[PDB]
Amino acid sequence: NIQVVVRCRPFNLAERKSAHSIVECDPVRKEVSVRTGGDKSSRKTYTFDMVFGASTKQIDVYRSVVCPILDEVIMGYNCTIFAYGQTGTGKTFTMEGERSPNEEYTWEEDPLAGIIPRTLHQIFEKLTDNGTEFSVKVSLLEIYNEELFDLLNPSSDVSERLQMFDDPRNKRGVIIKGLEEITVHNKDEVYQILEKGAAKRTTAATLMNAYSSRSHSVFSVTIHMKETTEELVKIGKLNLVDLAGSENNINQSLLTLGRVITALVERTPHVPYRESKLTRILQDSLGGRTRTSIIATISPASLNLEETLSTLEYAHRAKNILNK
Amino acid sequence: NIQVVVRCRPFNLAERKASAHSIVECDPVRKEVSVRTGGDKSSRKTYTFDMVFGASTKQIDVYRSVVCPILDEVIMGYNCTIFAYGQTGTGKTFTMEGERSPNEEYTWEEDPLAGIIPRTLHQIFEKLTDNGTEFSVKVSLLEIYNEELFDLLNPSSDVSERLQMFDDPRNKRGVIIKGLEEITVHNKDEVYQILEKGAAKRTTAATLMNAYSSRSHSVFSVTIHMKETTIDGEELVKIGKLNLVDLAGSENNINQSLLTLGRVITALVERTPHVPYRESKLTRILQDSLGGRTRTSIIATISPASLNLEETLSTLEYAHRAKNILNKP
Ligand SMILES: Nc1ncnc2c1ncn2[C@@H]1O[C@H](COP(=O)(O)OP(=O)(O)O)[C@@H](O)[C@H]1O
Ligand SMILES: Nc1ncnc2c1ncn2[C@@H]1O[C@H](COP(=O)(O)OP(=O)(O)O)[C@@H](O)[C@H]1O
Ligand SMILES: Oc1cccc([C@@H]2NC(=S)NC3=C2[C@H](O)CCC3)c1
Ligand SMILES: Oc1cccc([C@@H]2NC(=S)NC3=C2[C@H](O)CCC3)c1
Ligand SMILES: [Mg+2]
Ligand SMILES: [Mg+2]
């Protein structure tokens, strides 16, 4: 029920100057195949909900996985997309993207743009003149060493950690004290909010060891919706989650995520949500009422074989998770 | 002889609201900076420098007044170096590199927040394309962290790979960094992507190395080979170099290069016969910029906050002593 897709990254310039890809993707068979030994070899094979080869562009990812998810958010559902995988495989690439070099494109037209910018820009486009009044708010909550950080609040620095509490009102919910929600009033406000995030992230990285590889980041967008004739109320939420790299100090949230998934697929009565910040904040995305997808990202380099195999096995198990 | 300038940064968002009151007064006409060390009724310390720039100073004021006269020297065939020195948080990177105005408001070559490096490269092409000059520009970015050396512009190697340094056998007191890449910049439409590539590699450097942005020293080098032909058919072959150095934060891991830089300045001001250039990577790379044949400037960056009093005094004292260093043959 949880939707699991595989994305392979392409080779960097250093791998050319010349590397052989050990990963073969077959989208129509929806399968990924890894070469483990070597004219004559052994291979490992996995079927996923969708597979995306090294030639896949950002627009292909958005149109195939995000577009249907965003339609469901607009319908009034909560959705979550995780990116999972080894550092270096394209978790941030997929979730955020990058800017094309030399100011070639405006941010809205940049084909290297990832899920977060494309989504924000499309919400405004989809709801431009249907019967739906709406507002958009975003937050970016991050977890490093089991501490909480607000990367969007422009009035306090990143030494300041946030406090998490059980929410009495709705069970299995939490309240993050001091977490800021920025109203995104229109498309022309999006980019600078994203820039503020990047700036504060650069501060985080100088103060915290391997921040960009070791932190989990949860970019949340909330769409409040109202249609008329009588007022019909829709609230849509989407979490865009860029996990800490899965490579094997200790990452309690990452360890706990794995153990939660294990419990859910084995149908164990006890599921250890409370054992980390990440699984408490996202418990509804794991066997709850939220529609969830996982993008498992992998490398094509034979160097990365073991971690590529670990990610695939991990992601494949997760296919068996049921929610809603 | 080494020219020392002070740049006070403005107050940020978080302090203007806390109604922050500057302990720092800048008097550019009198080339002076005044610090309230006591704090209606106060005590003050006063320093005269070669140039002083208050909180109101823009990037273009810095360029026009300090950089354009030095670049003219580089175009003439001299080697020149500019250092930024000061506490983390004071504007060393803002001064040397600049930032982007938010929301894609401007192109890179018109951005008011652009710093020394992009302004210089844009202008080299502007200055030498205008008159009659065949020229070539080569750039390199060498960074020192934990006394190891990194090439932050090589787009064919990652930052695990540190370079080796050697004495240059022929020209005495020079150095050879093995493997350091020089990237030719053919035109001004090629500047921005190269700068971006450096920023990308820095991001990875920061992930791998603790407090990389605060603890590293970076040397951005520009080399201009010029074949000017005058209107009378006179041909000049000139080669100029400019090193734009963003030093590690001066606040009080030992930083051998930062420690050695201070001791080199002490030796050169007290006129001591032995100058400990050889005691660090930085002072070996830049030894000619410290009592050598290179014309050098230091830009000391400082904060207006009363909270930063002790480090602000430290910076000013450090920078003021540097005024007494002579170079050039
Ligand atoms: N699909 C892709 N297309 C082009 N480049 C990619 C792709 N995926 C990853 N990369 C490159 O690989 C590098 C590492 O990707 P990144 O997103 O930072 O990985 P991670 O977030 O998993 O550590 C980046 O420089 C990025 O440009
Ligand atoms: N002259 C200035 N004008 C406006 N903002 C500045 C100035 N100098 C520094 N800042 C701001 O203060 C912060 C610290 O700047 P930065 O260059 O990172 O300091 P350093 O490199 O010395 O640690 C940045 O957010 C920067 O935008
Ligand atoms: O092509 C892009 C268009 C818009 C945004 C993005 C990236 N994504 C996100 S989330 N934040 C940031 C991005 C930029 O690279 C750097 C600034 C922050 C790429
Ligand atoms: O306004 C700017 C115009 C051009 C360049 C710059 C900055 N400076 C230098 S050296 N590198 C980089 C800058 C950018 O902000 C980010 C990319 C790298 C600012
Ligand atoms: Mg990443
Ligand atoms: Mg800096």
Structure description:
The structure is a homodimer. With 324 residues, the first copy, chain A, is α/β, with parallel strands linked by helices. Chain A has a single domain (1-324), classed as Kinesin motor domain (Kinesin, 3-Layer(aba) Sandwich), CATH 3.40.850. Chain A contains nine helices and 14 strands. In chain A, the strands form three sheets. In chain A, strands 1, 5, 6, 7, 8, 11, 12, 13 and 14 form a nine-stranded mixed β-sheet that branches. A three-stranded antiparallel β-sheet of chain A has the order 2-3-4, covered by helices on one side. In chain A, strands 9-10 form a two-stranded antiparallel ribbon. In chain A, strand 7 and strand 8 (147-150) form a beta hairpin. In chain A, helix 2 crosses helix 4. The longest helix of chain A is centred in the middle third of the chain and has 18 residues, at 190-207. The relative contact order of chain A is 0.21. The A-B interface holds A 13-14, 17, 99, 101-103, 106-107, 154-157, 188, 191-192, 195-196, 202, 205-207, 209-213 and B 13-14, 17, 100, 102-104, 107-108, 155-158, 189-190, 192-193, 196-197, 203, 206-208, 210-214. The complex binds adenosine-5'-diphosphate (ADP) (2 copies), the ligand Oc1cccc([C@@H]2NC(=S)NC3=C2[C@H](O)CCC3)c1 (2 copies) and magnesium ion (2 copies). One adenosine-5'-diphosphate (ADP) is lined by residues 9-10, 85, 87-93, 98, 245, 297 of chain A.
